[PDB]
Write a protein that binds this DNA or RNA. Structure first.
Lengths: 254, 351, 253, 253
DNA sequence: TAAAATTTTTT
DNA sequence: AAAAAATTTTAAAAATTTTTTAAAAAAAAAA
DNA sequence: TTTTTTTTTTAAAAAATTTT
């Protein structure tokens, strides 16, 4: 009854590699308009918004709205089976408590049908209302990965004393201090290496950095991170898949 | 020993206290004041207050602790000799009398500590009731006779024989947490030689040559200074601690000149004070001959080790066998040359 | 103190070398250049470091000032930088914190880092400029390969030198290792040239944990200048091509 | 005895294959070639390694001599060799050691090795060779991939074979995993040469820990000659190119 | 047998 | 008012398994 | 042709519990 064929199965491999570390269980809210994932993490700090729309998949159809309970370390261990050029055919049924997966190599003649064991769990819906964020930072994704992975060695907290001329990641700890300042790059002519800065008021927020290290495993999905935050609303770390949707993480400040 | 010698050395000569790591000793034969380690190892080994009581009813905590310490010494290349206390003098026996009445006052506190039923108070006062016997000393002597770690018994005090062992050049350093070995005459002491926390706890290496070159003192004026800092045989005068005794040594340079040219009303001399006897005890103690007994280190036989520590105390087998195996592998290797033997020190920047 | 570096990967490789052997040392920073000369924690090995003024982009140093640096902390701060990164080590008057920036060469990511540091007391050994008997040059990856292979067998290497052959002998419970190295006559390159200055044959025994700690400096150069003589400690000299050398000293067994 | 190779990666990959699975085995070095018939340390699988003398560039084993070698230790000495070396085996009749010479191809790093042997008596007379039902020749890294990700699912592979293809079925607490291959002829292409010569179908269960131990041999050959029959132990044959063959036997449930 | 904490005098 | 004390209190352990992070290192895939 | 991550397989701490 549910069918989702995707030709770029590395996107789903990267999504479950991103969400395998902080999500133990989640509800895969599958509707007719696309694939959603309403999940608040295991330690109950960070909220994850994964949206995969209908136009990203090749063959996508749903009978009803599906919300099945998935152990995502089990789904990560069953999405480690696939290849990078491997296509992925999701499947599910009505009366069966089993999510099916079919991996097919296009240049070969190999098919690997995989079934999953689901469980019953309470469905959480925390709809974050959207607004024009006061701090929109469109920065390279590997640079944000570099910033989180090298500020992890200093302290558990990070402050982002951003400005309209450029963003400034700063952290303080018992080892020392560190201040990464990024100028707003315009003479690159690439729109992927440029740190695009759009604001109306500069802000400065104390953030947990182990959670940003858990956030930055989604870096092979996109070459750009859309950092969106404001004074009190949590930081949106948006990973724009180029033709499928967005993966948003939310981080409450310290 | 002395209430505040190490604070005085840290306040006066910070270059005298070296912070050498436990991995720095290979050819360094090390004198260990043994009974201090037996008391220290009978403090901390506790299962909520009761130590290691087996089926017979006698404690074995110091045996197993000194065991695993000794495997840590050979596994780190430190070559230890364990020297036990002898017959203490009468000036020391006044201090043992005040320790005995302190233990009796701990027992009188222990009466309502066990009447209240608190576990922490009864284990704290049982830690204060730790005292070694002759059979525990003979058990440790027999245990060091097993692994071939050499054993020496001083007639008076092990700290004096440790300091004369450093003075004879037979061992490299004495290693003890009391400061009496600097009083007894050792040019080098290794305070806090413990078997764990190498990153957290450096060894406070006290060089008495640096102490005498920083204070401008000979050995005997350092003995009168250590008398004035409240040793176990002679008290302080009246409220004289570190700085006033430093002021009296730096002006008078003799304890006789100190006791004559001080005021009879300002800091009066205590009655029945025996500074000459403690000075003669520090300079010339009853010390056994270091050339009479050799410092050997032989490979032990495993069957007698298993028959002792699994026969007469009924402990584990695999941990003891692996410790003896790594002791044997650490002992059979060749010696490692130290780099300061080949290169002399031109100084230290010290940041 | 302000020392702009033309590429900071060199000093990044220096801190990757020093993070496994030294935890605490002081940097003898003078007007003639950055020096470090400190012993081991196990007191077996000394690391002489020299970086003259002629390799930095700019160098000002008013006083011969030394700070006590945690090498693990400075290694974690030098892990923050890239490989084409430009590093200025900055320390002003009464510097409680050593300051670094890692200016990326596209002028897009300038990353300021100040490092809190402690007071130390490190003994500095006075070393002479000894005319070494057997001076052995070899490739650096080859020497790291030789030490890493011989450390599988036993803890002790027996570095023996003939008139034309270098004999890295080792033994243990696994067996007996014997890595022999001849002298080049047909290769004649800069990286790969096993050349021996020859005075008298030597035969010394060294520990291999300290040689494995020495061969964490192998991406700095392609030159191990193994200088040794009879009952004299071994010089392992990673000569950086513009900026001094990194001399590793090792007392024999 | 003197067995000189020309591709050192072959013997290095054989020892990395047999390191994890067998601890000690008897290298029955006959006059025809170096043979190792071994049984598992867990006493489940069986290894029959054959290395014929055509792939050895020099073979001078006059006496039929067999010794017991620790495979972990000898895999460590083969880990001391490089990725491409010239391995010259050497032994004497009176001497209880197996000498190894890894002559590097720059003709300078001639690295002699010696190794103590731990002799034992293993029954090398019960050998399972008979006619098999279905033989499956299919690429080696693909078989390593199938065994590696079915080890993620559970600890049982159910290999069902037919004419149109072979099916690797696994089940566990995580779920049900069926990897179905298809028979492709694949002329002039050995990247996906999945050929199945099937006579009788069979459906039976194994243990994927020993399949992971078997598929750590995969850098030797580019193909796996899978072979099984009805209630017969499965054969994983790693055909080395004109040098020998490494056959792994696994008794099923 | 050690270190520090808190109140106490000396200057 | 700092310095310099003398009272009072506290504390003394080594290590395998087991449990999580940091980390080499050959082995994946990169420019 | 050595790197970057990636994955992997050991290893560092860091604790509660023991080593009877």
């Amino acid at each position: 009854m549910f069918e989702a064929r995707l030709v770029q199965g590395s996107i789903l491999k990267k999504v479950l590699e991103a969400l395998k570390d902080l999500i133990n269980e989640a509800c895969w809210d599958i509707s007719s308009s696309g694939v959603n994932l309403q999940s608040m993490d295991s330690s109950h700090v960070s909220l994850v918004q994964l949206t995969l729309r209908s136009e990203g998949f090749d063959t996508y159809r749903c009978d009803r709205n599906l919300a099945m309970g998935v152990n995502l370390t089990s789904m990560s261990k069953i999405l480690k089976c696939a290849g990078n050029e491997d296509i992925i055919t999701l499947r599910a049924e009505d009366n069966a408590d089993t999510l099916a997966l079919v991996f097919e190599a296009p240049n070969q003649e190999k098919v690997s049908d995989y079934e999953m064991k689901l469980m019953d769990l309470d469905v959480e819906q925390l709809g974050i209302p959207e607004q024009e964020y006061s701090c929109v930072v469109k920065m390279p994704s590997g640079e944000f990965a570099r910033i989180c992975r090298d500020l992890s060695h200093i302290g558990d907290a990070v402050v982002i004393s951003c400005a309209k001329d450029g963003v400034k990641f700063s952290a303080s700890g018992e080892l020392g201090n560190g201040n990464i300042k990024l100028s707003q790059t315009s003479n690159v002519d690439k729109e992927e290496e440029a740190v695009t800065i759009e604001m109306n008021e500069p802000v400065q927020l104390t953030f947990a950095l182990r959670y940003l290290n858990f956030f930055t495993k989604a870096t092979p999905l996109s070459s750009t991170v859309t950092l969106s935050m404001s004074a009190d609303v949590p930081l949106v770390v948006e990973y724009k898949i180029a033709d499928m949707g967005h993966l948003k993480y939310y981080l409450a400040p310290k | 020993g002395i209430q505040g010698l190490a604070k005085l050395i840290a306040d006066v000569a910070p270059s005298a206290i070296r912070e050498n790591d436990i991995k720095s000793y290979f050819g360094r034969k090390v004198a260990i004041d043994a009974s201090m380690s037996i008391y220290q190892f009978l403090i901390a080994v506790r299962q909520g207050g009761d130590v290691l009581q087996n089926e017979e009813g006698e404690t074995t905590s110091h045996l197993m602790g000194m065991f695993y310490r000794t495997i840590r010494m050979m596994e780190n290349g430190i070559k230890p000799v364990y020297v036990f206390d002898g017959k203490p003098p009468q000036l020391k026996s006044g201090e043992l009398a005040k320790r005995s009445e302190r233990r009796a006052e701990a027992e009188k506190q222990l009466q309502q500590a066990q009447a209240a039923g608190a576990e922490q108070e009864v284990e704290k006062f049982t830690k204060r009731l730790v005292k070694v016997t002759k059979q525990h000393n003979d058990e440790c002597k027999h245990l060091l006779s097993l692994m071939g770690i050499p054993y020496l018994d001083a007639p008076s005090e092990a700290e004096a024989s440790c300091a004369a062992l450093v003075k004879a050049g037979k061992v490299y350093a004495a290693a003890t947490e009391d400061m009496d070995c600097l009083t007894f005459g050792s040019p080098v002491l290794m305070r806090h030689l413990t078997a764990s926390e190498a990153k957290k706890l450096p060894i406070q290496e006290f060089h008495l040559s640096r102490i005498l070159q920083e204070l401008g003192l000979n050995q005997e004026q350092f003995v009168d200074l250590c008398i004035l800092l409240g040793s176990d045989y002679c008290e302080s005068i009246r409220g004289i601690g570190p700085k006033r005794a430093v002021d009296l040594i730096q002006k008078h340079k003799s304890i006789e000149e100190i006791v004559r040219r001080l005021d009879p009303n300002k800091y009066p001399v205590p009655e029945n004070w025996l500074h000459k006897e403690a000075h003669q005890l520090f300079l010339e103690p009853e010390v056994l001959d270091p050339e009479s007994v050799e410092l050997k280190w032989s490979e032990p036989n495993e069957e007698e080790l298993i028959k002792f520590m699994c026969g007469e105390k009924q402990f584990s087998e695999e941990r003891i066998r692996s410790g003896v195996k790594r002791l044997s592998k650490s002992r059979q290797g060749s010696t490692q040359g130290r780099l300061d033997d080949f290169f002399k020190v031109t100084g230290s920047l010290s940041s």
